[PDB]
């Protein structure tokens, strides 16, 4: 009755889509967490949802570290949980993507992380690990593998400025970004350059999606 | 010998009204809170008690989220100890009232929760579930329902001032409250508009009540 | 092997004094005391010595709750950790004195608790519980009984005057104190008034005391 | 499956160098550690590694305590966990050093601890307890046995300076050191006086080692 992850719970035999219990290894209090029964057999753990724009995303590095929104709605889980949940075993990411057409892509990594072998995850800025994309949306994060998380208030990028506060979100920035899905809901096209919910390799520079999903599980 | 609640103390044969060490699901370190056994058949998690007004009730975010007074008086079990019992199980309430003439009346509540759904509850602010109202009391609590927690240091109403600063408690106020049992113990009748503990369909706006007692047992 | 106590590691068979792990019901991390395996049987864990003046006691607050020294010498478990131990059982209370010319006495309390029924008992102030005294070194704890803890940074005693600062240490003072034994090692006779580490039934108000042990078992 | 240390992974059947999770006595959520599964049979829990001046440690207080850098390469993994793997046995320490010619040698201490008998290790500055030296370096920490931790922040050196300001580390300062392995990374001979990774029994007090690492076992 102590599952690590969504996958967990689904072999346990819970089938359908909701928020369910999970103790991650090092994280044994556990928290709640939405889980995608449905997609590729089932088993996901969700940790980053856009639908409606609803929540504010222009947050700083506290609100990324402990998490903010409803696990029914659009939230981030929160660094800390990915990072719990990431450390535990090997890792797949999907990412769910929708334009305002009712298009749809996802991409697949075969491997994901964040602060992976860091001592102190969070001053180490939770550092991503990415690699073997697959999928429709093509690839958007293959080239921030290795950058440390940025905020409007902690800048681990490597740009001259700060790139949370340049493209209004909160990402693993380089020097900036080919997704910034934590980016503002600015609703399709929009004539700002590349600050909203952007997944440069389907939809360029210049169209905020309608809905984003990202969510992990064990290879 | 870890139960979750004041309904797995009475099922493992302790009967008596007292203190009891309880361990939420999400909160394994556990605490003491005080059990009614014997309100229909018993069971009970006691989280508010006001009966003679020793302790004051006019405090901030931090004392309303971990709690304050003593467990055999009055007293407030705290939000972040609300939102571990009240997201593990299905619980109802049971609010218990006495004015100054010996009377008393009662509302039960079929579905209560503290930020059921909230990544963070705290920056949430431990937001009210609650529905489906039966008693002798009347309902004063079904239009606070999807209302944030609000204190005096800590503004989430739906009024241009801050509800609890103005009503003098600590409550999820809309604009401002039908109900504030965490208001001030004026004692009976008072010329003061709506700042006593007052639940507005038993005994109006103008009348801070003797007792009452919220608590919570698994549906 | 997660004894509760001293008495627990004494009745899993460890009879040697030192410093044991204990897991208390609501601190499951558990930590280390020193364990009193000798005085009327054993199974003693203590939370305060003096004997030679080498750690500072006039400490404020953060030190009280989180304790200070070392468990093989002069040290404070802690009121955290005090109030961890005494709510999981019913305790008694042993205090062993010993003066400059090799005299000893004790007092033993049939009942002692921290903050037994607070719901946060660091914001309650740690009140003392403290009945039924038997000894030989007469009673200066009894008018304690209700007392919140007061340091010179915390004021929670009944005097106009805040009586840490007054008596050079940290206690459940009333107005102010009748035992002090947190008070400055100032080593036997003293012109100063009841500022030394003073126990007022034995040695009265100018006699700070060798040696003191406050320790605790369950009956 | 919840080890202590490297040595209990290494008897579970694991003989790979890498990271493993390790569940110290008084850590139960447990956390991330290197293991050197060969040096002398191995099961050596790593707590320090220098190899290519890669990471800062010229840090304050909180870093020491926290830990920093990465398990896979140079880092510190904090006071606190040294203390909760330090506490729940006997451990001894291996030191493994490397010159710029490729020249190697060791230190072995029979005995290794940090805040042993603390009641707060952190106010106490997680005091060092050292003896037994064997090895081919010669010893350059006996001297340290006793010292609190002090930072650059944070002195509780035997100094009128601050030795960790001096010396540009952080360590069990005296007056002030035989060894510096948390100095600066000089690489090698440099004219600056005992400021960078110094092990002086073995290369004086200006050569900057270009390799260490600091590993405990329960003896
Ligand atoms: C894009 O998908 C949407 C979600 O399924 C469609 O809206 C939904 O249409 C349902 C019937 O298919 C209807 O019961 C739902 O109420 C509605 N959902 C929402 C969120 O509005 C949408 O369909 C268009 O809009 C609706 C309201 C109807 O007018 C349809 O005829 C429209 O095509 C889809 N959009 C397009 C452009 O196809
Ligand atoms: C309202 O209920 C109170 C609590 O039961 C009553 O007071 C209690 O009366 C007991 C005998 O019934 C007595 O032993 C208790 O000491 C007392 N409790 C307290 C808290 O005072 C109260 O009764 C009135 O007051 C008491 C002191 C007597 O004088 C009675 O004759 C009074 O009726 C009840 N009040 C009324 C108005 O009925
Ligand atoms: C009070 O008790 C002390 C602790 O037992 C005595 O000192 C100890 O005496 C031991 C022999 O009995 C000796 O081996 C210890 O080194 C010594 N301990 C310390 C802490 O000094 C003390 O005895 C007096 O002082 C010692 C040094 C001798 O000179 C004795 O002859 C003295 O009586 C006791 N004091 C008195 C006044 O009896
Ligand atoms: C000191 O040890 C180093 C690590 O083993 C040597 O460098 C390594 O040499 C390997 C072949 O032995 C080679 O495959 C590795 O790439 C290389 N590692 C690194 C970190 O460079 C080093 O050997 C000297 O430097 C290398 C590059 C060659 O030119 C050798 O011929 C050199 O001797 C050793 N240094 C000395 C002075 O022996
Ligand atoms: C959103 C984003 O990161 N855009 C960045 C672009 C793109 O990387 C580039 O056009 C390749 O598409 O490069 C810069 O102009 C640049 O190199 O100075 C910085 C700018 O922040
Ligand atoms: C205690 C309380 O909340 N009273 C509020 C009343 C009642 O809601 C209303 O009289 C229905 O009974 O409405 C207001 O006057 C209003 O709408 O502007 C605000 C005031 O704060
Ligand atoms: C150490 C201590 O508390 N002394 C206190 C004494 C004794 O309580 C009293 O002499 C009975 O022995 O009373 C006071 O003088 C007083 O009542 O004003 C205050 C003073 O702080
Ligand atoms: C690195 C270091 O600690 N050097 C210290 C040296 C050596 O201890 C001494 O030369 C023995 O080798 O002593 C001092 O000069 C001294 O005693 O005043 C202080 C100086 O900080
Ligand atoms: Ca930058
Ligand atoms: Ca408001
Ligand atoms: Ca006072
Ligand atoms: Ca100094």
Redesign the interface.
Known sequence: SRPRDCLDVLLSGQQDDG?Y?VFP????????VYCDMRTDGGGWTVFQRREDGSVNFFRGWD?YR????????E????LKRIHALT??AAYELHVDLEDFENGTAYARYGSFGVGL????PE??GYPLTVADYSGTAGDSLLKHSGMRFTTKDRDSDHSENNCAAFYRGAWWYRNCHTSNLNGQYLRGAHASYADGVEWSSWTGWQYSLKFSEMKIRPV
């Open positions: 928020v219990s290894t090092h994280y044994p209090a556990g928290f709640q609100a402990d998490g903010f929104g409803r696990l029914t709605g939230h981030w889980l929160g450390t535990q072998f860091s001592v102190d001053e180490d």
